[PDB]
Design a protein around this ligand. Structure first.
Ligand SMILES: *[B]([O])([O])[C]([C][C][C]SC([N])=[N])[N]C(=O)[C]1[C][C][C]N1C(=O)[C]([C]C1=[C][C]=[C][C]=[C]1)[N]C(=O)[C][C]
Lengths: 251, 27, 11
């Protein structure tokens, strides 16, 4: 995250870190949606242009973390993957359309003060909150800029959803209904954006109707980070909820 | 179910430092 | 060198 701030303790207890076993590194962000299901971006697991195609045993999931590099003894929980499910029509060839994937945990993770699942939006909540101007919140351990480098702890930044025509007019990439962009315009002054390493993490919103946090998007792509005139693009979670439900229901 | 309710915030009726910014944008 | 070692009950 660029132009964010340190997250408060237990501020994002559904935050998950996708960690490569060897060489040991942060792969992406993710989110906890139940005690055995983790949501992330498909391109975090499968991206043939860069020769990325991770299998289950290549990865680990670290839940309840704050510090980026330290092993948070007695706080963070580490889970192995049972199975990965990538959207069948995930478009890695062109524009990352339907950039979503689910990961089933080998065993349920125990909830705590630092581990707790986020909600997934129904049609009404989506209809009510996914409006241009309304702000969401993105969290991750990704880069702090485009060339410091990486944070010591989980970063957070609130960003407004941007009008679909503005999103489309800011890039040459073909945008779809399975995406939405967020961030401030050059004339707005305020800054912020997700960056490399933040992919797969959640863009949440706190419903004012029931004061619950809902994951509306998944950090997907962007041309650079926090560039004037550019916006961060996110996977439209509600639009792909039927697929999510089907997977969890069937598996 | 209990989803989206943070143990260290909503569960204790404590607000984080910037969640108000979100609320203020839901006009 | 970046990341601290995971205890070996898992890794
Ligand atoms: B992620 O994996 O951590 C990363 C996040 C990028 C910045 S997000 C922002 N500023 N809000 N995701 C990406 O790198 C994705 C995965 C494959 C390429 N991609 C990009 O963001 C591309 C733009 C693009 C290329 C092909 C299809 C869709 C979009 N960005 C650049 O080419 C590299 C900087």
């Amino acid at each position: 995250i660029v132009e964010g701030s340190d997250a408060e303790i237990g501020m994002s207890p559904w935050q998950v870190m996708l960690f490569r076993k060897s060489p040991q590194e942060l792969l992406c962000g993710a989110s906890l949606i139940s005690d055995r299901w983790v949501l992330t971006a498909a391109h975090c697991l499968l991206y043939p242009p860069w020769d990325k195609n991770f299998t289950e045993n290549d990865l680990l999931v670290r839940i309840g973390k704050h510090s980026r590099t330290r092993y948070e003894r007695n706080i963070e929980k580490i889970s192995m993957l049972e199975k990965i499910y990538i959207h069948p029509r995930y478009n890695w060839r062109e524009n990352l359309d339907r950039d979503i994937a689910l990961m089933k945990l080998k065993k349920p993770v125990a909830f705590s003060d630092y581990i707790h699942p986020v909600c997934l939006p129904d049609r009404e909540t989506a209809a009510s909150l996914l409006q241009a101007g309304y702000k969401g919140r993105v969290t991750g351990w990704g880069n702090l800029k485009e060339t410091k480098g990486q944070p010591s702890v989980l970063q957070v930044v609130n960003l407004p959803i941007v009008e679909r025509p503005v999103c489309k007019d800011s890039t040459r990439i073909r945008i779809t209904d399975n995406m939405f962009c967020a961030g401030y315009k050059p004339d707005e002054g305020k800054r912020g954006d997700a960056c490399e390493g933040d992919s797969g993490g959640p863009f949440v919103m706190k419903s004012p109707f029931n004061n619950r946090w809902y994951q509306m998007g998944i950090v997907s792509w962007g041309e650079g980070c926090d560039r004037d005139g550019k916006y961060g693009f996110y996977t439209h979670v509600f639009r792909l909820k039927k697929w999510i439900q089907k997977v969890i229901d069937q598996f | 179910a209990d989803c989206g309710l943070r143990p260290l915030f909503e569960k204790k009726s404590l607000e984080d430092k910037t969640e108000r910014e979100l609320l203020e944008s839901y006009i | 060198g970046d990341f601290e070692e995971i205890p070996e009950e898992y890794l």
